[PDB]
């Protein structure tokens, strides 16, 4: 989901 | 033609990794910490962390350790950027002059590879013979140590294994063995290899290929007295080597995965344990002996002993304490007791490093509205989430205001021996002196015996021996407690006025021009010194005795006139020491001899605004640096005033300033006040810690903030904020938000801990039934923040499987209602994309959250800005365009379609608007021709782009995917029908920060147009401006000066640090220009600044000028 990736490419890790 | 500029106004505060050992001395402990481009090196100590030394690097720091070869004095210190530059530094305190020097370095990247999974590895060999790394799948590149190798030369051995986890070199190996987790097909398993540098290959590795579990995950090589391996996955931890095979698995850990690691016991019989959740383990080795015989282990096990910040980076250190390097949140200084406190958690916190986290929104406001911005984040992430508030300067809180014009001075004063409070304040005043009794809070004038009224006091200090002191024109006068009259009197023989006063608790030291005295408060009478007369006229006078001296002063230092000038001498007899013969018409209006923790100091303000400060030694007096400053435009007067343990220095100008203290330095940050002329302490039963200060006309009080040129407040969420906006007319922020859950036995959701939006005021949940047909899930809330009380006033809960992804507050249509709208969208893993979600119109009434209006969409809404008081909105691959009905509902009028997913949009308040996902921003208006939208143009390479925005209507910000900087603008072309359907990159550049918002706003004021600020996932908030062709080049060209003048850490180039990068473009960088660099000119000596320049005009200290009229951009 672009979700998961995208919400996450915030944290960084 | 494009022009920028970019400067860091808050360095990363993220800890991407840190290490331990002994880099300063053989003897001394050294905690290195790791930012981004800056590396931070303490000295641990009983208290905590000595700071010791700050250097950034040009580059972001991806590997990081401390080792030692044969024949070596300290530790060495290896660096890998993720540009691929190695190097190797080493600690050099020259004395007093401290460096970090680079023994080797050179580029190790390879034209091959595709770079791999779980990213770059740097590991290196006990024995210290090499160093191995892991950049790109199949190779393995070995850097070979020796006393050459100083460029770092290494070659690739060829690995058949095309995916590797993680990996370590193991102890007690005879050949530099190397031990892996790979994953192929079926699962995951260990392998070992030697390596061999000879023939450069490998060989074969100890012990035979293992299997490892589908989610082992980290590689613990445990030191030589046990040597062996640690692999650690999910649920479950093992040990390997050779024959020897140990396993476990504790429920404990099931919950969470381990993430980071640390040995504790040299001998590795203990070792700490990171985990996404924040809990920390000890992981324990069980020994066990028999006689002619070494040690095998018998079990192993894991106990939870609480919880820390989320923990990337985590390193033991003294006597069970522990330094924890957290991203997601703030980084912790922690204690490990051996018994649990109150829960059952062996761990406490000792200190906490503030850490705005990943900044996944932001926004400004003048809270207090003034003029300056707050600033205002969401940060961290899970249970380190949060809001921080960030405000430039020192600011003070008013109790009373006695506006009187005129004011020319004051000093302190108590009315009784007894209270270290006071209760008059007497001021020098335009050729007069009033003074001011008080009831304890209120203000009063009267009078005071032998104290002038009609002429004008120079000064007023607290002279030991029960007596008050006042110096006048004229008289240096006594009256005293007991008394209390006529005490005593000293008038100069033969009728001259005191110029310069200068009164001690015990001694006094006036001027008469070149002429100076000297007398004693000696039990209730004026004794007299000494005479000496100067080359020429005493310009200013300080004395206090300083450190070891009881009232009784040492040495001294004196302004004077026509030569413009200050000097070094002692006390009766009044002999020159040292002196500096300071250039310009104008002379030191101001002298300071001071104290702090561990020195002595002297301070020199002139009329112009600018000061010079040196270093004053109490036994040998000389020198010390020279190095002007700004300051005001206007004569600064410095005084010293009460605060916490180290009590500092103010700095009465326009621009009012304090001088704190740094590392062992002095902090020289502004005063959130308009101008202030003197000022000093106080302590009254009324009006307590305050200080006084004067202007024009006004006298004020009160106390006084931190320190550092930012002062950050916040607000913890226990939660993951994602965006931020504020409904001024309502007095609040709104602010999305996100919590976890878990599947129940019931089935439903439960939680983890309160959260912001559980703990909240008040609380909705959504009704609305658009839809119809352990375990993990985000739980998401709208939440209304009060601005002043920064409290969770009201909570809306969003659907079960909805995220709400922007939101905005604006008035549309008619309507004279200010709104939070909201897209949202269902969200599930087994959907790539989600196809249904909503856009939501929300109210805030007296303490109320209507419902206004809902919306589904056929899409997730990835934005939306308000726009000319319509609503803007980007549907997962749309952009739409809709309108507020009178009758109160969303309703399209337009949209766009030829995006591959529009991620951000932003809007030239007119009808032009901008952004894509996985190409780089097109632009569009809007016409009130059919009301239509036209795309104008794009840019056509291919950027992941990750936040947008426009500096005016012809340039286009973007950030992306790969921590570049770039702008767009549109082509000045014939032929519009091609050359004008595609805009050019007209600048490019490296940030090395990956950007998650831009908005204008400026954190300052009440040569650069504009200005835009950013936040990045690594807490770093840079600004960009806009520039003039001229000053483009002024800098341009001063770029490369400056640049052959520094000497980079790793000897790394600034132009290869600045080069617009990606896995496969590198273009050198065009229209930007880092004031970071440029800023860099003035830690610079000046005969280095000399050089600076060979050469409309061009001078020498011009430009000194220029480059502070920036650093005061932000």
């Known amino acids: 989901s672009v979700v998961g990736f995208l919400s996450q490419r915030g944290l960084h890790g | 033609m494009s022009y920028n500029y970019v400067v860091t106004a808050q360095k990363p505060t993220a800890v991407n990794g840190c290490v331990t050992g002994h880099f300063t001395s053989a003897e001394d402990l050294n905690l290195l910490i790791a930012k981004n481009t800056r590396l931070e090196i303490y000295v641990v100590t009983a208290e905590g962390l000595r700071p010791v030394k700050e250097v950034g690097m040009y580059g972001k720091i991806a590997v990081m350790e401390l080792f030692r070869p044969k024949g070596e004095s300290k530790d060495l210190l290896f660096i890998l950027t993720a540009k691929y530059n190695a190097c190797i530094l080493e600690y050099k305190q020259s004395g007093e002059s401290i460096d970090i020097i680079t023994r080797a370095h050179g580029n190790v990247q390879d034209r091959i590879g595709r770079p791999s999974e779980t990213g770059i590895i740097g590991i290196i060999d006990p024995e210290c013979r090499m160093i191995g790394l892991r950049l790109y799948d199949g190779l393995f590149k070995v850097i070979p140590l020796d006393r050459d190798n100083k460029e770092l030369k290494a070659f690739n051995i060829r690995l058949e294994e095309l995916h590797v986890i993680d990996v370590k070199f193991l102890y007690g190996c005879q050949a530099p063995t190397i031990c892996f987790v790979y994953q192929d097909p079926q699962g995951r398993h260990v392998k070992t290899y030697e390596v061999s540098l000879r023939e450069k290959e490998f060989n074969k590795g100890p012990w035979k290929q293992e299997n490892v579990e589908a989610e082992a995950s980290m590689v613990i090589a445990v030191p030589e007295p046990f040597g062996g391996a640690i692999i650690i996955g999910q649920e479950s931890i093992t040990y390997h080597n050779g024959d020897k095979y140990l396993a476990i698995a504790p429920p404990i850990i099931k919950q969470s995965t381990i993430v980071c690691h640390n040995r504790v016991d040299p001998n590795g019989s203990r070792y700490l344990l990171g985990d996404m959740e924040g809990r920390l383990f000890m992981l324990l080795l069980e020994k066990e002996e028999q006689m002619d015989g070494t040690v095998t282990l018998k079990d192993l096990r894991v106990e939870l002993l609480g919880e820390t910040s989320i923990?990337?980076?985590?390193?033991?250190?003294?006597?069970?304490?522990?330094?924890?390097?957290?991203?997601?949140?703030?980084?912790?200084?922690?204690?490990?007791?051996?018994?649990?406190?109150?829960?059952?958690?062996?761990?406490?916190?000792?200190?906490?490093?503030?850490?705005?986290?990943?900044?996944?929104?932001?926004?400004?406001?003048?809270?207090?509205?003034?003029?300056?911005?707050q600033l205002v984040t969401c940060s961290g992430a899970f249970k380190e989430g949060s809001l921080r508030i960030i405000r430039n300067g020192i600011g003070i809180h008013e109790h009373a205001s006695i506006d009187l014009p005129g004011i020319k001075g004051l000093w302190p004063l108590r009315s009784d021996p007894n209270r270290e409070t006071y209760d008059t304040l007497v001021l020098s005043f335009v050729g007069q002196t009033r003074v001011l009794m008080l009831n304890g809070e209120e203000v009063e004038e009267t009078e005071l015996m032998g104290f002038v009224d009609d002429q004008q006091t120079f000064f007023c200090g607290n002279v030991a021996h029960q007596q008050l002191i006042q110096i006048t024109s004229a008289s240096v006068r006594l009256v005293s407690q007991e008394p209390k009259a006529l005490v005593s009197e000293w008038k100069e023989p033969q009728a001259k006025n005191i110029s310069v006063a200068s009164c001690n608790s015990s001694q006094v030291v006036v001027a008469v021009g070149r002429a100076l005295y000297y007398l004693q408060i000696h039990p209730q009478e004026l004794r007299q010194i000494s005479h000496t007369e100067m080359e020429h006229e005493v310009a200013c006078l300080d004395i206090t005795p300083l450190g070891d001296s009881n009232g009784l002063s040492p040495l001294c230092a004196i302004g004077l006139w026509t030569d413009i000038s200050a000097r070094i001498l002692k006390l009766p007899s009044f002999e020159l020491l040292h002196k500096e013969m300071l250039g310009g018409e104008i002379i030191p209006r101001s002298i300071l001899m001071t104290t702090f923790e561990s020195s002595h100091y002297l301070l020199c303000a002139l009329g112009d605004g600018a000061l010079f400060y040196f270093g004053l030694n109490i036994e040998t007096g000389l020198l010390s640096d020279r190095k002007k400053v700004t300051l005001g435009t206007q004569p600064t007067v410095l005084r010293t005033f009460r605060s916490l343990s180290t009590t500092n220095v103010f700095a009465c100008s326009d621009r009012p300033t304090v001088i704190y203290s740094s590392n062992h330095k002095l902090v020289f940050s502004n005063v959130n006040l308009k101008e202030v002329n003197y000022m000093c302490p106080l302590n009254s039963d009324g009006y307590p810690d305050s200080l006084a200060l004067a202007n024009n006309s006004t006298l004020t009080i009160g106390t006084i903030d931190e320190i550092q040129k930012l002062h950050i407040r916040?607000?913890?969420?226990?939660?993951?904020?994602?965006?931020?906006?504020?409904?001024?007319?309502?007095?609040?922020?709104?602010?999305?938000?996100?919590?976890?859950?878990?599947?129940?036995?019931?089935?439903?959701?439960?939680?983890?801990?309160?959260?912001?939006?559980?703990?909240?005021?008040?609380?909705?949940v959504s009704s609305s039934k658009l839809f119809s047909s352990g375990?993990?899930?985000?739980?998401?809330?709208?939440?209304?923040?009060?601005?002043?009380?920064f409290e969770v006033l009201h909570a809306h809960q969003f659907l079960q499987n909805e995220y709400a992804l922007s939101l905005v507050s604006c008035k549309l249509g008619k309507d004279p209602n200010t709104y939070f709208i909201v897209g949202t969208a269902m969200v599930y893993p087994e959907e790539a994309e989600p196809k249904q979600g909503?856009?939501?119109?929300?109210?805030?009434?007296?303490?109320?959250?209507?419902?206004?209006?809902?919306?589904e969409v056929k899409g997730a809404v990835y934005s939306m800005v308000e726009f000319n008081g319509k609503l803007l909105a980007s549907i997962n691959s749309t952009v739409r365009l809709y309108e507020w009905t009178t009758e109160k509902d969303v309703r399209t009028e337009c949209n766009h379609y030829n995006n591959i997913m529009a991620l951000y949009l932003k809007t030239k308040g007119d009808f032009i608007l901008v952004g894509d996902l996985m190409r780089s921003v097109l632009l569009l208006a809007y016409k009130p021709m059919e009301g239509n939208f036209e795309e104008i143009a794009r840019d056509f390479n291919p950027n992941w782009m990750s936040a947008v925005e426009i500096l005016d209507d012809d340039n286009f910000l973007g950030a992306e995917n790969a921590f570049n900087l770039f702008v767009c603008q549109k082509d000045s072309a014939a032929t519009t029908?091609?050359?004008?359907?595609?805009?050019?990159?007209?600048?490019?550049?490296?940030?090395?920060?990956?950007?998650?918002?831009?908005?204008?706003?400026?954190?300052?004021?009440?040569?650069?147009?504009?200005?835009?600020?950013?936040?990045?996932?690594?807490?770093?908030?840079?600004?960009?401006?806009?520039?003039?062709?001229?000053?483009?080049?002024?800098?341009?060209?001063?770029?490369?000066?400056?640049?052959?003048?520094?000497?980079?850490?790793?000897?790394?180039?600034?132009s290869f640090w600045r080069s617009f990068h990606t896995e496969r473009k590198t273009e050198p960088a065009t229209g930007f220009i880092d004031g970071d660099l440029i800023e860099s000119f003035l830690d610079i000596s000046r005969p280095k600044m000399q050089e600076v320049v060979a050469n409309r005009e061009a001078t020498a200290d011009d430009l000194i000028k220029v480059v502070e009229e920036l650093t005061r951009i932000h």
Request: overall charge negative; glycine content about 8%; proline content about 2%.
């Open chain 2, 977 to 1054: 029908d091609e050359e004008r359907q595609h805009l050019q990159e007209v600048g490019l550049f490296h940030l090395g920060e990956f950007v998650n918002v831009f908005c204008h706003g400026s954190l300052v004021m009440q040569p650069t147009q504009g200005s835009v600020l950013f936040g990045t996932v690594n807490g770093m908030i840079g600004l960009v401006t806009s520039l003039s062709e001229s000053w483009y080049n002024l800098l341009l060209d001063m770029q490369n000066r400056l640049n052959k003048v520094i000497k980079s850490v790793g000897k790394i180039e600034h």
């Open chain 2, 775 to 789: 375990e993990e899930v985000e739980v998401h809330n709208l939440l209304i923040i009060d601005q002043h009380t």
């Open chain 2, 714 to 764: 916040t607000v913890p969420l226990y939660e993951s904020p994602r965006k931020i906006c504020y409904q001024e007319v309502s007095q609040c922020f709104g602010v999305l938000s996100s919590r976890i859950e878990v599947q129940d036995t019931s089935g439903g959701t439960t939680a983890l801990r309160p959260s912001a939006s559980t703990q909240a005021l008040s609380s909705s």
């Open chain 2, 838 to 855: 909503r856009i939501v119109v929300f109210q805030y009434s007296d303490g109320k959250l209507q419902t206004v209006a809902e919306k």
């Open chain 2, 311 to 373: 923990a990337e980076c985590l390193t033991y250190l003294d006597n069970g304490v522990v330094f924890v390097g957290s991203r997601l949140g703030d980084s912790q200084l922690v204690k490990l007791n051996v018994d649990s406190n109150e829960q059952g958690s062996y761990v406490v916190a000792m200190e906490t490093f503030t850490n705005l986290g990943p900044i996944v929104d932001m926004c400004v406001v003048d809270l207090e509205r003034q003029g300056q911005g």
